[PDB]
Amino acid sequence: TRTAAHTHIKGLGLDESGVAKRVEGGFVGQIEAREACGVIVDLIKAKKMSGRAILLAGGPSTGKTALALAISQELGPKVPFCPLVGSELYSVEVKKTETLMENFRRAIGLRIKETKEVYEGEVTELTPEDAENPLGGYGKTISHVIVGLKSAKGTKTLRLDPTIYESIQREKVSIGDVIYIEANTGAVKRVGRSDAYATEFDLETEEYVPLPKGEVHKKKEIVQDVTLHDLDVANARPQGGQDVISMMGQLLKPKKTEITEKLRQEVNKVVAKYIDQGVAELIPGVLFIDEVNMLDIEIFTYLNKALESNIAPVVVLASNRGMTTVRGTEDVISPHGVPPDLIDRLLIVRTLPYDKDEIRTIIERRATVERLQVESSALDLLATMGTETSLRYALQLLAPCGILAQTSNRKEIVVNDVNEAKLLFLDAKRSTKILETSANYL
Amino acid sequence: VTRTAAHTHIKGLGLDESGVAKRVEGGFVGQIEAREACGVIVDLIKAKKMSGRAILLAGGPSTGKTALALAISQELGPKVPFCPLVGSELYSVEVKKTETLMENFRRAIGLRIKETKEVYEGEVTELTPEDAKTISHVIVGLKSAKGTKTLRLDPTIYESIQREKVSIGDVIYIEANTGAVKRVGRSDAYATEFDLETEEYVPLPKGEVHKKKEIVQDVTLHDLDVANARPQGGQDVISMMGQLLKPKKTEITEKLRQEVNKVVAKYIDQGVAELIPGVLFIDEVNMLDIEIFTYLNKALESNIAPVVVLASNRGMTTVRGTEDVISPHGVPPDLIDRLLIVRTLPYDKDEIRTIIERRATVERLQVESSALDLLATMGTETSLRYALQLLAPCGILAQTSNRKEIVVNDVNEAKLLFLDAKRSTKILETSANYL
Amino acid sequence: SLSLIAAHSHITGLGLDENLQPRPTSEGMVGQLQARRAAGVILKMVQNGTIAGRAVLVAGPPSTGKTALAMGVSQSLGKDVPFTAIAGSEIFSLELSKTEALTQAFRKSIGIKIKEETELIEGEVVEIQIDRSITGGHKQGKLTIKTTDMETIYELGNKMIDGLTKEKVLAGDVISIDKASGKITKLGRSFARSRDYDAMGADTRFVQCPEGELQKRKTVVHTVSLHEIDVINSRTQGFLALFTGDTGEIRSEVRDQINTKVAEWKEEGKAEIVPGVLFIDEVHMLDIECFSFINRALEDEFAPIVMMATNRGVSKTRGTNYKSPHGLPLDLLDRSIIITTKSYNEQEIKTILSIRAQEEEVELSSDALDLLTKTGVETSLRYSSNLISVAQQIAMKRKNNTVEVEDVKRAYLLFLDSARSVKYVQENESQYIDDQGNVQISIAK
Amino acid sequence: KSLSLIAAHSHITGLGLDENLQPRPTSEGMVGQLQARRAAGVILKMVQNGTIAGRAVLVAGPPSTGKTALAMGVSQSLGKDVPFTAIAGSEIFSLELSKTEALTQAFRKSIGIKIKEETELIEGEVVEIQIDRSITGGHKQGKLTIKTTDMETIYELGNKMIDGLTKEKVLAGDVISIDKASGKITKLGRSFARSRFVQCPEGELQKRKTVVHTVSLHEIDVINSRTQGFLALFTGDTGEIRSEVRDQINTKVAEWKEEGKAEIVPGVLFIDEVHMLDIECFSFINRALEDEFAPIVMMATNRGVSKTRGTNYKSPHGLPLDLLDRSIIITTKSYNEQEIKTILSIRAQEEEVELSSDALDLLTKTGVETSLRYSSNLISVAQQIAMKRKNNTVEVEDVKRAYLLFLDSARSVKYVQENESQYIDDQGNVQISIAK
Amino acid sequence: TTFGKTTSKFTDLIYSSRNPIKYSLPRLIYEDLILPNYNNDVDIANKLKNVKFNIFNPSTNYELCLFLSKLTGEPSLNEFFRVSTTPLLKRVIERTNGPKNTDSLSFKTITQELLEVTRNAPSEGVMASL
Ligand SMILES: Nc1ncnc2c1ncn2[C@@H]1O[C@H](COP(=O)(O)OP(=O)(O)O)[C@@H](O)[C@H]1O
Ligand SMILES: Nc1ncnc2c1ncn2[C@@H]1O[C@H](COP(=O)(O)OP(=O)(O)O)[C@@H](O)[C@H]1O
Ligand SMILES: Nc1ncnc2c1ncn2[C@@H]1O[C@H](COP(=O)(O)OP(=O)(O)O)[C@@H](O)[C@H]1O
Ligand SMILES: Nc1ncnc2c1ncn2[C@@H]1O[C@H](COP(=O)(O)OP(=O)(O)O)[C@@H](O)[C@H]1O
């Protein structure tokens, strides 16, 4: 098992219709932020509001990304979640507006159900039946095609259209192969060769596959999940044809293009047409952009434009700044690096720094998840380090202590282990103190 | 007949067997220490044992750094690769500058392959294929003026023969190893079948049909890298019209470089190839950004890096890409630790006079003694390059007066007609509106 | 062999015992008895593989051994574990974004292991007999394959005959056939039939006839990085993008699909994940957005262990207007553990110079080595290291085997360090080009 | 041939010089600038000798002093079959080439290779053509009768001649040229036979003719590179050609000159407004001038001590001192009254304008007062005002009308400077309304 | 164009359109740079750079070919050497939809999975109309 700075958080930890408790879901403290995130989860599950922005702000190492992952865990794996960094919007292929729109459309999911009728199994016979009165100037005038199927606890012969014989000849279907017949479209295809013919020849490069189970004929309801961006990039590219341009573009580098609003409008039109029949279901998700201080003001104005759309999902922003200038402007001093036009459109959630006991419990649970055993005195020294230097510095000094314990053939973490880890690895403060007092051209 | 461009009186470093340098020998005058250190660098390069050796040579303008680098390239010989470069050429609009630096690094490591050229040529007398439809082999009979000779051929060369529309009586060209087929044209014995025809007629070859020749092929690692990394695909031998899509330079992945090194090592271990490391010379290194200066630190630690020579004339100059960094010669202190600095000294009056006499000798001009003294005084007063540039208008003005020897009057007219930078600046300062 | 003597090629692994205790001098590296212990802890961290996404920082003065420490970690890591070593200027690309270049450098340093068991039939084709039925739907074949030792006869299928009609084989053709997978290759032509066709052709090649048995059993273990799977599953013919670098901003949905695919392979059990180390030399010259993406990209499960080296003090971060310690912002320094390297003394410089002259096959006297040690105390170490190789050639030009004090003095006279160059520029500043472009060319005033 | 209405330098047919390189006061459309014309004649002899290479000269002076006139005089004095590249300083700033690559292409476009080859040709007038077909039409037989003013003959045609004459249909009385070795046949025209129009050819029907080819190094560089064909010489997408093919072309050209199959004809590269190049381009120019295949570079600039581009300091002529160290400088001077009136009379003769003496004196006075180009622009625009009143010669009233209608620099600045509330300033402030 | 015009039992109509602009090339450049002969090494260097030192050659680089065959799933190990040595237009013209084995590192994306459903799908289906 691999653990990387997370995966000790499972959900938020609220009860039903009530206050989140202190010890639940891997969270310690941050009670008001957890209640606000639970209300946000309920608003997402209501499936009614569109284009809502929530900016959650605080100091470094407070639990912003932990709360975003708790949002994604509480919503479930069926609800889409697109984690975005603010540096990802700048590309050298398309404009940043198109990248923002693509990541915007990636957060809306569609649930499509369909009933499929199939005819699969091993081919028993293949006889193109001739007509009673053949036409002159031709040979082997097919009246119908007789195809016999064989599956596990099932055998059925079928009458086919004469036009299926061209598909039989095209895909090279012989006796003993296993096939897969769609009902309405016809369009047979070769799954492979049956396992009973695996020892037919000495040397043969042929896919051998097991005989399929169940009856030859079955009705299955298949629920498929796609996002709107997949529909956009599939409708945008030209379908499978015989022109040189399509296969030449398939054989080349797939450079992104600025998808027009007309294609998105028609996609929304046909999607709404298939919701109102009761077939499809629309699932909005969360587009999470953290460290939004790196965004340019043009992206902020396009966010202002794009948040008014009908199909827009909920977007969650995170920032750790105070009174800083917005990038791209030299005088707009603004809170959290966000221009005041966007700030009026969003609700602000505040996260608070921790204490002695919260840092101690966080270190204890992180050592529990990392499969390590620590003593009481080592835990108290680690908590003193966490409230002295940084919480993340105390969290990153656990596994090297486990290595130093395993070097001395001990499964216990004690005081001299964390003292050796202090003497080996430095934090930022002692590094800066070394830098400030050294004049060796460093 | 003969051309001269600022050089070609430089034939070598001009050293004896002990490594010491004479005063006037090999076209070089003065600067004994720099020439001796350059000879030491030449011997280190000829040792073929070290990689990533960086050398900086520094001095004032018109002191002879480029002449010293050209002397290195002449002393090493034509077998050793030499890639001269200016620092402005690393900036391109197709790929990043680091990839261009890596290409210029790998351009300086060469290989030598020994190959044999085998050629059949002559007039076709018999072309009789047979089937094993699939043809098993074709038998071709060739005729020249020294006899005839028949050959069995594989069907691929028969297909290439059918590509050139070869019939009976056509003079063709077959290479035995590669398999290329070239149709020269119809022979002169069939030139009177028609009075007018669209077919050119060539005579028979006067030599044998069979020709054997040993040749040496010199390639570098960059040629193999660009041969193995064509993105569009393999090109045909003859394509006079261009490709349908324009090939552009790409960022070559280091895995391809690893595979090329593996293949070259495998071919070296069988005694076919010989490894010849060479010299990458960068002039005006102060025109480089700090990103290329950082990437040079990584690129000098490779096991196949060549010997790098840098030349600069700046003093305590700000490095490009920085605002508050003052460094000697425009070279950052992280990189100036890794090289060895060779200093280059300015010249005196007698050295300038000898340089002017040598340049008049190589340009095939005759000058007087007093004209030489005046040109030496002019060179000491304005610049050394000014007299060298003014030597040839003096010869033209002497030619227009029907004389074969430059005198003081022609030097006076050349001084009057063409100005230097100092007099042009003094005109620029005392002028009303833009000179 | 295509390797010459590089700058630090004496370093073969970290000089540690079983208890992670560094020796004073062993297997290449001299001194630095705490950075070696910390790098050994980092090596055991990588070799355990149970944690992911942690960045360490190697900080110290220049010419101390940070990249020597990285080379030692790379050499003691061994094979089959990926080690990507990039510089700071490589990510600024004209055809690729900075963040996507960082993502590709992250995913080139973590791979999976695939085990393949093969059954190879390599031999020379003698005769092929093709038999057809009455219907003609399927074709049967006879293969007569011959080794130097023995010869036997196999059977063909319809797909085998169809795949042998592609890439035409004749008598005297060296092929190899896998029993399980049906892989087909044409090794070339035997040397026994190199004198019949009288002219080779373009597509032909001559290989020796194999010996030994026909059906040889051998297993192969493949190590495939995640970036290779990303490049392959993004195009119709993607290996040319692997060897030419024109991948061009691979979409994130195929990366999530490949992550789920690798998780499915690990749970089912046909592959296992081999983590690795990504080394970024000179991390101080990276843009602040790259630092932000490094901060947020280390929390994924498929993230390697990052090593960064910086020789800068409190300097200005690129892309911003302020000054920070080590040239990096405080958010990245919070997500780090710093390894500090310290400068050497006379004995360590003496041992390092002795090792470097030992590898370069240069024999020094005791007094010449003492002079080189004094110069390495006064000037930098690399000046002495280059003076060794220059003075060896000076000794060969004098027809001497071992170098002497005179060769080191001649190399010190003929070649200059930084301080003497700075002084000689400063006392003759009129002959060099100033910041304002002012210079004097004429020597007589 | 070389269609042109009227150029601004159309009167300069070359450098007016004697056999002793002495400038006449008025010859070949050039007047004044005696020392500059003598220096340009010396540079012309340097180009024509061809024994030295890679020398850069600089033409610096005040604006409107005839620097471009000197460059056009040198270009016309060189004549044909010698390369002459004239580029501006803003042309090299490409989006798909680098600056060094564009400078390299401009350097190699200015040196050429002279190759002499001979090709045997047939050209005459077609008398009569027979095409014969068999019963099945498998074999085609033919006879062609072709004549000149001195002979007549009949040729027995093969199959490919028959297909080459059926394609691009040739009838009787047609004058054609036939290349046997390539199969290309071109129709010259029609003969003068009433019973385009070209006369009948004379002499022998089968002539061995020698054609002298001149090809630049950039063309062989483009063809030798396998990435793009010869169509990139016209489309213009060469795209950063590698240095290896340049080295192969260098070695091949050197061995061709050594064998004697080809000669090297160097030329002149003229850079106009050289002060607007970056310092990287200047640094490339310093190290590109010592190659064996380097042309003679002419630069023209008119600036004083100004800021060099890409830097933060000021330099003489807008160029760094190391570039000026390898240059010999020709300085041009301002004109007098007599030279201005002679220039205006020559421009009158080239613009088919008849001028009175008083109109010429008024033009000379207003040219000395303001600008030479202002008078040279007013002289052509006064003729239309003269033709509006239906008289041929341009009088004083037409010149005064043109002076009233069309302004110059100084009067426009004077009119702006007390009306600046009506014009947009540096801060974007303007007043539109008449009142308040 | 400059074609063959008429200056006025079947009539022949042959395509003869040319361009008025003529580019003249001497024979020496062609015969000494593009055509092989005894005194040049065009074919030798072409073979040396395309066959002997190619990294997709199975006679010298079998490990890379086996690695790429595991990666892609090509049934033939000479596929990469054939792909790397023919032009792009020739590659796209004769591309065949050959089968690939399942035991490989590459399978189908979601977009292509949606794509192969609607090759011959009729109307009124939801996935075809979407
Ligand atoms: N309330 C909490 N409960 C448990 N762990 C926490 C809590 N807050 C922070 N952490 C831990 O701190 C580490 C860093 O927090 P992070 O999400 O980076 O905060 P921020 O986003 O504010 O920088 C995470 O690995 C997380 O597990
Ligand atoms: N020692 C020397 N002997 C002969 N010629 C020299 C010497 N030093 C320099 N030169 C000549 O001076 C000219 C300019 O020198 P150059 O190499 O440009 O110096 P830098 O590269 O420092 O500007 C060259 O053409 C060279 O031939
Ligand atoms: N611990 C060490 N043992 C042996 N050699 C060392 C050691 N540290 C540094 N060196 C030598 O110093 C030279 C350059 O040092 P380097 O590792 O580049 O320092 P830095 O990484 O700080 O720039 C290398 O060639 C290496 O041989
Ligand atoms: N000596 C001269 N002889 C003939 N015409 C001249 C002479 N000097 C200048 N001119 C004319 O002056 C006009 C403008 O001069 P121009 O050469 O454009 O100025 P500049 O040298 O600043 O480019 C040109 O049409 C040119 O013909």
What is the B73 CA–ligand 2 centroid distance (Å)?
15
| CA angle, D30 then D32 then D33, to 5° | 105
Query: At residue C146, what are phi and psi to the nearest 5 degrees?
Result: -135, 135
| CA angle, C61 then B99 then C295, to 5° | 55
| CA angle, B146 then B148 then B154, to 5° | 135
Query: What is the C-alpha to C-alpha distance for residues B55 and B51, in angstroms, rounded to an integer?
Result: 12
- Reference B217, options D329, E46, A194, C350; nearest CA is E46
Strands (E), B201-345: 201-202, 210-220, 273-277, 279-283, 307-312, 316-318, 326-328, 340-344
Strands (E), C323-362: 323-325, 337-340
Per-residue tokens: C212: 């030994």
DSSP state of A336: T
D100 to chain B nearest CA, in Å? 6
**E115 to chain A: which residues are within 8 Å by CB?**
234, 239-240
**Residue E122 backbone class (left: φ over 0; alpha: ψ -120 to 50; beta: rest):** beta
A22 burial via Cβ count (<10 Å: 0-12, 13-18, 19+): middle
Q: Which of B235, B241, B400 sits opposite D231 (nearest CB)?
A: B241
Beta bridge partners of D227: none
Query: What is the C-alpha to C-alpha distance for residues B156 and C201, in angstroms, rounded to an integer?
Result: 7
Could you tell me if B36 and B44 are in contact, meaning their C-beta atoms sit under 8 angstroms apart? no
Q: Which chains touch A (3 or more CB pairs under 8 A)?
A: C, E
| Helix (H) or strand (E) segment spanning residue D281 | helix D279-287
D342 burial via Cβ count (<10 Å: 0-12, 13-18, 19+): middle
CB contact under 8 A, D100 and B1: no
Distances in Å between the Cα of A236 and the Cα atoms of A96, A263, A312, B91, E116 are: 19, 8, 20, 37, 16
Token pair 């020994």 in the structure block, residue: B114
Query: What is the C-alpha to C-alpha distance for residues D343 and D357, in angstroms, rounded to an integer?
Result: 14
Query: What is the C-alpha to C-alpha distance for residues C355 and C373, in angstroms, rounded to an integer?
Result: 13
Half-sphere exposure in the Cβ direction for B344 (13 Å, CA): 23
Query: What is the C-alpha to C-alpha distance for residues C298 and B307, in angstroms, rounded to an integer?
Result: 39
- Reference C291, options A293, A391, A436; nearest CA is A293
Q: Are strands C111-132 and C272-274 parallel, antiparallel or unpaired?
A: antiparallel
Annotated binding residue D64: yes
Residue E96 neighbours by CB under 8 Å, 6+ apart: none
Helices B349-362 and B369-381 cross at an angle (nearest 10°) of: 120
DSSP string, A20-46: PPSEETTEES-HHHHHHHHHHHHHHHH
Query: What is the C-alpha to C-alpha distance for residues B88 and D286, in angstroms, rounded to an integer?
Result: 11
b/e sequence C166-176, b meaning 16+ C-beta within 10 Å: ebebeebbbbb
Beta bridge partners of A287: A82, A315
Query: What is the C-alpha to C-alpha distance for residues A420 and A410, in angstroms, rounded to an integer?
Result: 15
Residue C58 in 3-state DSSP?
A: strand
B147 burial via Cβ count (<10 Å: 0-12, 13-18, 19+): exposed
Beta bridge partners of D330: D59
AA identity, residue B363: E
Per-residue tokens: B428: 């620029």
DSSP state of C7: S
Query: What is the C-alpha to C-alpha distance for residues A407 and C45, in angstroms, rounded to an integer?
Result: 12
Continuous H helices in B290-368: 290-299, 333-336, 349-362
Please tell me chain D's helix, strand, coil percentages from 3-state DSSP, rounded to the nearest 5.
35, 25, 40
Q: Could you count the other beta carbons within 10 Å of the beta carbon of residue E22? A: 7
Query: What is the C-alpha to C-alpha distance for residues D333 and C57, in angstroms, rounded to an integer?
Result: 67
Q: Are strands D314-315 and D306-307 parallel, antiparallel or unpaired?
A: antiparallel
Half-sphere exposure in the Cβ direction for C5 (13 Å, CA): 17
Strands (E), C262-371: 272-274, 277-281, 305-310, 314-316, 323-325, 337-340
Residue A313 neighbours by CB under 8 Å, 6+ apart: A50, A51, A104, A107, A108, A284, A285, A286, A287
Which residue, by CA, sits nearest to atom 11 of ligand 1? A63
AA identity, residue D249: I
| Helix (H) or strand (E) segment spanning residue C42 | helix C35-48
AA identity, residue C444: A
Q: In what order do the strands lie in the sheet with A286-290?
A: A81-85, A286-290, A314-319, A53-57, A346-350
Distances in Å between the Cα of A421 and the Cα atoms of A92, C317, D89 are: 43, 29, 63
b/e sequence C275-304, b meaning 16+ C-beta within 10 Å: bbbbbbbbbbbbbbbbbbbbbbbbbbbbbb
Residue A280 touches partner E, C-beta closer than 8 Å = yes
Could you tell me if D100 and D148 are in contact, meaning their C-beta atoms sit under 8 angstroms apart? no
Query: What is the C-alpha to C-alpha distance for residues C373 and C350, in angstroms, rounded to an integer?
Result: 6
What is the D63 CA–ligand 4 centroid distance (Å)?
9
Q: Which chains touch B (3 or more CB pairs under 8 A)?
A: C, D, E
AA identity, residue B54: A
b/e sequence A241-276, b meaning 16+ C-beta within 10 Å: eeeeeebbbbbbbbeeeebeeeebeebbeebeebee
- Reference C246, options D312, B99, A385; nearest CA is B99
Annotated binding residue B62: yes
Query: What is the C-alpha to C-alpha distance for residues C29 and C26, in angstroms, rounded to an integer?
Result: 6
Beta bridge partners of C114: C222
**E66 to chain C: which residues are within 8 Å by CB?**
220
Residue B416 neighbours by CB under 8 Å, 6+ apart: D35
The alpha carbon of residue A348 and the mean position of all alpha carbons in its chain are separated, in whole angstroms, by 26
Query: What is the C-alpha to C-alpha distance for residues A398 and A382, in angstroms, rounded to an integer?
Result: 9
Per-residue tokens: A411: 């499964």
Q: Could you count the other beta carbons within 10 Å of the beta carbon of residue D149? A: 12
DSSP string, E42-65: HHHHHHIIIIIT-TT-TTT-HHHH
Computed on alpha carbons and rounded to an integer, the radius of gyration of chain B in Å comes to 30
Query: What is the C-alpha to C-alpha distance for residues C252 and C261, in angstroms, rounded to an integer?
Result: 14
- Reference C98, options C254, C245, C291; nearest CA is C291
DSSP state of E31: I
Residue D251 neighbours by CB under 8 Å, 6+ apart: none
Query: At residue C95, what are phi and psi to the nearest 5 degrees?
Result: -105, 0
DSSP string, D187-230: EEEE-S----B-PPP-S-SEEEEEEEEEEEHHHHHHHHSSSS-T
- Reference A432, options B94, C312, D111, D427; nearest CA is C312
Query: What is the C-alpha to C-alpha distance for residues E100 and E106, in angstroms, rounded to an integer?
Result: 10
Query: What is the C-alpha to C-alpha distance for residues D297 and D284, in angstroms, rounded to an integer?
Result: 13
Beta bridge partners of A130: A142
* Torsion angle defined by CA atoms of residues D31, D33, D38 and D39, in that order, rounded to the nearest 10 degrees: -140
DSSP string, B66-120: HHHHHHHHHHH-SSS-EEEEEGGGG--SSS-HHHHHHHHHHTTEEEEEEEEEEEE
DSSP state of C208: P
DSSP state of E94: T
Residue C67 in 3-state DSSP?
A: helix
- Reference B119, options B3, B198, B212; nearest CA is B212
Residue C309 in 3-state DSSP?
A: strand
Q: Could you count the other beta carbons within 10 Å of the beta carbon of residue C105? A: 19
Distances in Å between the Cα of B173 and the Cα atoms of A97, B100, C205, C298 are: 61, 40, 22, 64
Query: At residue B129, what are phi and psi to the nearest 5 degrees?
Result: -80, 165
| Helix (H) or strand (E) segment spanning residue D348 | helix D337-350
Annotated binding residue B65: yes
Query: What is the C-alpha to C-alpha distance for residues B3 and A424, in angstroms, rounded to an integer?
Result: 69
- Reference E61, options E49, E46, E78, E75; nearest CA is E78
Helices B290-299 and B97-106 cross at an angle (nearest 10°) of: 40
Could you tell me if B210 and B219 are in contact, meaning their C-beta atoms sit under 8 angstroms apart? no
Could you tell me if B2 and D50 are in contact, meaning their C-beta atoms sit under 8 angstroms apart? no
Residue B71 neighbours by CB under 8 Å, 6+ apart: B10, B12, B13, B26, B28, B35, B38
| Helix (H) or strand (E) segment spanning residue D36 | helix D34-49
Q: Could you count the other beta carbons within 10 Å of the beta carbon of residue A16? A: 4
Query: What is the C-alpha to C-alpha distance for residues E120 and D172, in angstroms, rounded to an integer?
Result: 62
Residue D117 touches partner E, C-beta closer than 8 Å = yes
Atom of ligand 4 lying closest to residue D69 CA: 17
| CA angle, A294 then A295 then A301, to 5° | 160
Per-residue tokens: C70: 């990285």
Query: Mutation test of the interface with chain A: which of C18, C155, C178, C296, choosing the one with the most A Cβ atoms within 10 A?
Result: C296
Resolution (A): 3.0
Query: What is the C-alpha to C-alpha distance for residues A228 and A287, in angstroms, rounded to an integer?
Result: 14
Per-residue tokens: A273: 């047409």
Residue B218 touches partner E, C-beta closer than 8 Å = no
Could you tell me if A379 and A364 are in contact, meaning their C-beta atoms sit under 8 angstroms apart? yes
Indicate whether residue C72 lines ligand 3 (CB < 6 A): no
Nearest CA in chain D to E6: D169
**E34 to chain B: which residues are within 8 Å by CB?**
238, 240
| CA angle, D339 then D342 then D343, to 5° | 85
DSSP string, B170-222: EEEEEETTT--EEEEEEEGGGTTSSSB-S--EEPPPSS-SEEEEEEEEEEEHH
Distances in Å between the Cα of C126 and the Cα atoms of A300, C123, C205, E68, E76 are: 73, 9, 18, 29, 21
- Reference C291, options C249, C323, C328; nearest CA is C328
Could you tell me if A121 and A218 are in contact, meaning their C-beta atoms sit under 8 angstroms apart? no
Indicate whether residue A66 lines ligand 1 (CB < 6 A): yes
Query: What is the C-alpha to C-alpha distance for residues B384 and C441, in angstroms, rounded to an integer?
Result: 8
AA identity, residue B103: E
Nearest CA in chain C to D320: C437
Query: What is the C-alpha to C-alpha distance for residues D328 and A28, in angstroms, rounded to an integer?
Result: 81
Q: Do chains A and D touch (3 or more CB pairs under 8 A)?
A: no
Distances in Å between the Cα of A244 and the Cα atoms of B248, D15, E60, E87 are: 21, 59, 35, 14
Token pair 């297993």 in the structure block, residue: C219
Residue D304 in 3-state DSSP?
A: coil
**Residue A328 backbone class (left: φ over 0; alpha: ψ -120 to 50; beta: rest):** left
Query: At residue A217, what are phi and psi to the nearest 5 degrees?
Result: -105, 130
Query: What is the C-alpha to C-alpha distance for residues D102 and D111, in angstroms, rounded to an integer?
Result: 15
Annotated binding residue B61: yes
Residue E76 in 3-state DSSP?
A: strand
Q: Do chains C and E touch (3 or more CB pairs under 8 A)?
A: yes
